[PDB]
Design a protein around this ligand. Sequence first.
Ligand code: MG
Lengths: 64, 1406
Amino acid sequence: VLCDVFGQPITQADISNPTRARDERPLDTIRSFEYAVSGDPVWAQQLETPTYGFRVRPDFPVFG
Amino acid sequence: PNEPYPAWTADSQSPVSIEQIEDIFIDLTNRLGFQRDSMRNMFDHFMVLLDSRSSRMSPDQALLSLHADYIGGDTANYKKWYFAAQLDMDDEIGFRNMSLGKLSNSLEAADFRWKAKMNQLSPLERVRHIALYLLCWGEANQVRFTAECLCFIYKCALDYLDSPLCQQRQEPMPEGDFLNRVITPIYHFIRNQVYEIVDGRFVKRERDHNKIVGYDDLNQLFWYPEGIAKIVLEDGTKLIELPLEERYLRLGDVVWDDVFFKTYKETRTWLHLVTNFNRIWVMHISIFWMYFAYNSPTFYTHNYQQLVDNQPLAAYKWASCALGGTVASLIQIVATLCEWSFVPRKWAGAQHLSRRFWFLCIIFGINLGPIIFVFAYDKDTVYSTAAHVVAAVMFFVAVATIIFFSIMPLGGLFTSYMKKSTRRYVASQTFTAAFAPLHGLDRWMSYLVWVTVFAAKYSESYYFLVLSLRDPIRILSTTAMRCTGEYWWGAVLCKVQPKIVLGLVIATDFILFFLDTYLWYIIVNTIFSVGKSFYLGISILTPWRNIFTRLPKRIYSKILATTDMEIKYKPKVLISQVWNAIIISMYREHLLAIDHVQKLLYHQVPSEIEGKRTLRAPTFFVEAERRISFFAQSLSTPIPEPLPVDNMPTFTVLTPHYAERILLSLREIIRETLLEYLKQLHPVEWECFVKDTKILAAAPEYTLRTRIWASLRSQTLYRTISGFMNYSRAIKLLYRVENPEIVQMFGGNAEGLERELEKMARRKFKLVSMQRLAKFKPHELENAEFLLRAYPDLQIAYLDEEPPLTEGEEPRIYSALIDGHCEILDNGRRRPKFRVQLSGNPILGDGKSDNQNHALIFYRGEYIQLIDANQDNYLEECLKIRSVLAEFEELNVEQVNPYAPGLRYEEQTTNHPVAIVGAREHYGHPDFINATFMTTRGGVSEDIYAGMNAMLRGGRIKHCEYYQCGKGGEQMLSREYYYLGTQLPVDRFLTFYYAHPGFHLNNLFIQLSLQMFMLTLVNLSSLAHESIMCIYDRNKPKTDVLVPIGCYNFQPAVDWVRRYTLSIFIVFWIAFVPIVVQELIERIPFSILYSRFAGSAIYMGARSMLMLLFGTVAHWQAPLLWFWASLSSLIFAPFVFNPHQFAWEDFFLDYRDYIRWLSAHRTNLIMAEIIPCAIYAAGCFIAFTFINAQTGVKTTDDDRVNSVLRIIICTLAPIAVNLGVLFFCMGMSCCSGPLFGMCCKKTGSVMAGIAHGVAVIVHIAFFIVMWVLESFNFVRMLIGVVTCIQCQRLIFHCMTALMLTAWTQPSRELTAKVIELSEFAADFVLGHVILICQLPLIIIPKIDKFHSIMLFWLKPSRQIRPPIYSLKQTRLRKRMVKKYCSLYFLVLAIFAGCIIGPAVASAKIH
Ligand SMILES: [Mg+2]
């Protein structure tokens, strides 16, 4: 019954914010905030959550 | 363009991309278990900071500056904590701070290694370091108030991260682990000490303040390496015994109830006063002692007599004046003894006092010895030049000791001599002794002002002291009023009266000695401030037109940043677009009519065929007036030049809200009427509004417009919100004015230009916290949604609650953020941007601080402005925002590498940043806050405490002269006062003392001196009445007998009264001048008016009036008129200005309202305060008995007589009567309520009336028994009455003092009741005594017109008729007027009879 901006649905809800997806990375939130002001289809086509997920990108350097 | 963060993402020189910054946050959240929705918020915060700092410098410098400010720099708090705790370098830091002037395994090597390590970091490691700290800070809840605990947690987490345990672990740590394991136990410890659980609810349990561990007590544990060692686990092992990589994982097993403890305890206020300000009494009392001792040879001259003029040996004179050093050495010892009760005995730093005590007593012994040698009879009987040499040396030694103890601060007297390995300082130097020094002329001015003040004061006081007291001392100390005395004690009761009078005179002058320095300080400050004007070139003689004519050039050169632009356009076309904007802005607020507009606007009318004729200046240059005048005046002072709006930083406005009104309802408009009251206050605006209404037009829109109009003139949140939204339009106006190429390149597309301007305005300007948004009434939510519809860019924060996950467990509490662009759910609520879970209820203590704390995580930018619920702002003042932000001295400075190897600490120029900027029409209420500096050292709140904390930590405070803010005591026993008093240098200490506490001390000293003078006057008048007098003038020879044989000289005693009266009159005039200055530029029922001044110079006033009357009747002196007039004016001033008090109807309505209103070691310390009452009562009793002693007349021998038993009956009879009445009330069915319910529901009033009646009757009996002896003498009763009252007060005070430290508790209740009844009885008499004096003033019929004349001197001078009421109200009014006139006249008749009856009795009775 719940849905996000751009109409895409939601299945796993966040623990602290029940109205947001669990695996959404911060850049997607920034783009959604920008889209909320002015209607632009260009903001919706730059999402990257499903292809990468919440894990870090490959070839991320190592610290120590 | 069209990017989230243009300053960083659109630059090709950025060292790290945004996609490489997001992954660091993601990895940290995975590894440490932070909440995700807080991680998003902190990512946004960090990116906004990077965008803000990159708009005026390179990204490479921005990242390095952020790292230096947050972790590794000299301005960072983390480095200070590290060096103070881990490396144990506090003593070296204090020593370096002590000797900075001479400078400008060791501290230098440690700093070198730290800089070398910090100099070779990659940018990614810097980003990780900053991100970890921000993530830790975002979750801290109430731990944000304690910076050092957070630093310790951050260090533990950083140590755990780099270990192989974290790197080789496979699965991520479960979400929410940090908050559950680390923060919740500390929150529970904080909460469980204030509240206790009963019946399932939390109730604020009560205990003395010394058994509650506040926030400051937790913080101070993490300042020392010894405090860290006290952390213990459950199994019994210490935390520090584990290796460095495992302390984080076991941080959830610490039991905090066995660790924290109290570090500072309070006591009686006089101990704090003595300890904090020891440097002042040393420089006062020591000088007074020398002045008095040098001019009183009688007390140490062998067989002294002025007639034989035998001067004492000079050796005695020099030895006596050398005792000044001993007094100073004793004061320091006494001050050190008191300090031993403030700090724990085993806490670090407490061992300095024991070392200091031995040095102080050694100095005392050194100062004491040689004087004892000189005074010895061996060198008194035989003269020796060696004794004279010893006295001459000791004089200079004493002077040097006085100076040394008057200059050096108490904390740090003998640090360099100890050289011990133990703590050499009582308090931490890093966190409590980091004052910022002064540089330049301002440093020299501070020395010069105080040197001038003290040089003037010490030279002026001696001239008056040498002569006002030389003769009275000589006359009084040698006279002998011999008598036979009273043989129950002896003749000692009469021979010591002159010496008692002399002692009282000396005591009064000692107090008078303290009032001159404030006077001289005021005078010198005024003179220097006036003189500085000629260097500043301030001109007041110039005409206002000479200011108005220069306005456009000042606007062009100080408001616009036109220096950076190429000069393509003329100044006038730029000035016009701003002047017209301001003028039109004032018009739309209904402040100007249509005809007034064209007198001020720039016009386009003239011919366009020639380009020069295009524009013409207004005739003005060839509430609106107040604002224009202030703007024109403020543009005259020098202003820093601004930056272009594409280079300015970001700032936020923060507002708290609790139960305030958002909008006025229709009932508030049409009911009582507010609308008529507003219309008769603001007419012209009302005609303007109604005229404007029909231009565009149940009348919904008209009703809404009326609601808005009424709201804008009343105290509402909408007024404040609409006031401060002028920041956005000012920024848009400046942006479009300062570069016309962007305007031109759109070519008529207005919508695109508006969108582009709004996009720019959103970046630079940003918040209201409503803690009750989930609890509003429906009409409150209806108003709240209106604000979001009117201003889409407004943000709101509120608290939200959920039912517990597991059954029977505390509910969860969250914090949410919404704004005007959020989607509306089908429930009617808006979708939150963020939700962050808290560990519990955040509001523990009352105040706005806990409201601001939970909403502080949502701010953005670099600077914060703190406002309140009701404040106002204007468009003209918002245009100068860019110049105000330049006061922090960070916008146009050179960028350097903080980690360069060659740089030394003394060569750095950015050691002390600016923390607070406060507006004025060096403490003050803060307006603008440096966010980075303040949020890393605690919260933002309490204002004066925030100022003290910022000063102590090492920041600076400045004031802005060209900005105006639309704004519209004895608890200071704190740590801050102690730290400031015991560690500041002398000049700063004097400047601080003479501003805040010196005013209150002066107000106390004046009141004390008045009572001392009254006691001296009573005793002197008694002696003068008893003695035989002689009169003489200054034309006297050296010594000759007076015409009356055998009289006693007392004329200098009379002269002293005149001199003291003149001095006190001058002091009162100087203290009253500011009230006149404040008041003379602007031209209530009796119960509350009386209650306001009750206990404030009214009871003491009457007590002084009684003694003044006695001193007047017994003996007459001319200067007593001034005191009579002053006291009468003080008593009767408040009733003069009461509106329409002359009217009979108002008078008796007030009378009715008044009448119906009537209807361990602590043991001796808590009771040592009774002595001053005992001394005063003893003085009054001696004065009373002296007249009874019959000293003036030749006394009969061996006849005994006494009157003390009369006095004890006088004092004890009313208390016994009251106790008997209470016993009778107990006997009359106190075990059955209904009898009292049926007879008198408030039966205590009957007992109160009986007590008042018997109290009057006992005084009547006093008068009768006294006038049995005296049929024509009156002076003799008043001193006895005063003695009786003072003994009553002493008994009550001693009873209360013993009470402060079955019928056991009923005994306490009865002890309270007995003083309560006497207090009520006194108040009853005092009220009528006040009222009867005003009777003749209301009798004359002409008082009405004369009082109404004063209405013309008053500014408003507006009166409207009272609302209409029915005739029955008039009938009741006249009936009550009749009743209360009769009652008033009957009471006055009783009072008059009470006096006239004994007058007849004195004749008819024996
Ligand atoms: Mg203010």
